[PDB]
Ligand binder design. Structure first.
Ligand SMILES: CCCO[C@@H]1O[C@H](CO)[C@@H](O[C@@H]2O[C@H](CO)[C@H](O)[C@H](OCc3cn(CC(=O)c4cccc(O)c4)nn3)[C@H]2O)[C@H](O)[C@H]1NC(C)=O
Ligand SMILES: CCCO[C@@H]1O[C@H](CO)[C@@H](O[C@@H]2O[C@H](CO)[C@H](O)[C@H](OCc3cn(CC(=O)c4cccc(O)c4)nn3)[C@H]2O)[C@H](O)[C@H]1NC(C)=O
Lengths: 133, 133
């Protein structure tokens, strides 16, 4: 288990930036954002090779412990053995996730949070920097 | 409170860098580092005007919930309403705290910690970036 941060108080429009090292033999990594471990407005899960999936970004939510409906994106701007930065903001409608190689997508905001207060990292990604604009 | 982070996995010799905003009306701010909230190898508390002190850094430890003996530093390179970076490293014997304007001091590692896994901020200091080298 990686870094866990709480009391983030990230408000709408504000940008969370996370930079880390993807392991040379990375299979999967996770960035979870929300209120706490049972309440995630974003589970962000790039799979290099995990759960039968190759080079696929899997996203979901978790509401009161229940996983929501999974969604997949169609670009994979991550390499094993490289540094990667991810930038995330939100409003009441969507989270906007900005990634390397110019790519960006929205994920619906399915929870009712006033602020994002919790972040947790897991898997094959070593956090080097977190910034809270 | 302010930001709380766990699973930091900071090891001897590694540098934890914290940048933030000292409030315009600052009286006091705190960075706590250790194993968890009850086991702090460093309670770092710059006091502009608080708890009987003026322009003094107070340091302490907390061991199993019990506060140690306070140490007061000789330097105070902070001002209200400014940005500040603090860099912390540690080893067997001491924490080394590097402050703005080239100041630094040592505080004994009273718990003999071999890893720092917990950090928390409180008071008139808003964390904007946390980095690991
Ligand atoms: C809809 C049902 C379809 O079948 C599958 O069902 C699976 C089980 O529910 C589903 O996987 C789960 O998807 C969730 C998101 O929708 C989560 O990604 C579930 O994992 C949660 C998790 C695991 N971990 C630890 C981790 O990622 C990790 C831990 C250590 C090392 C490492 O490289 C990674 N953290 N969070 C993950 O197990 C698969 O994504 C899903 N596949 C499809 C195509 O939908
Ligand atoms: C004046 C005669 C009594 O002596 C005092 O006794 C005090 C109580 O023991 C002692 O203070 C405590 O020292 C501890 C370290 O030895 C801690 O600093 C105690 O505070 C814990 C604390 C508080 N906070 C929240 C905080 O920093 C904050 C929160 C909101 C606004 C703000 O400006 C600041 N975080 N941690 C702090 O209350 C003071 O250091 C001590 N002072 C002297 C000069 O001896």
């Amino acid at each position: 288990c990686g870094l866990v941060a709480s009391n983030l108080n990230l408000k709408p429009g504000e940008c969370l930036r996370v930079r880390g090292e993807v392991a040379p033999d990375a299979k999967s990594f996770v960035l979870n954002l929300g209120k706490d471990s049972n309440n995630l407005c974003l589970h962000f899960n790039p799979r290099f090779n995990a759960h039968g999936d190759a080079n696929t970004i899997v996203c979901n939510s978790k509401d009161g412990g229940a996983w929501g409906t999974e969604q997949r994106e169609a670009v994979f701007p991550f390499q094993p053995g490289s540094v990667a930065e991810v930038c995330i903001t939100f409003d009441q409608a969507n989270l906007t996730v900005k990634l390397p190689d110019g790519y960006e997508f929205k994920f619906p905001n399915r929870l009712n949070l006033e602020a994002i207060n919790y972040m947790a990292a897991d898997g094959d990604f070593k956090i080097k920097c977190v910034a809270f604009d």
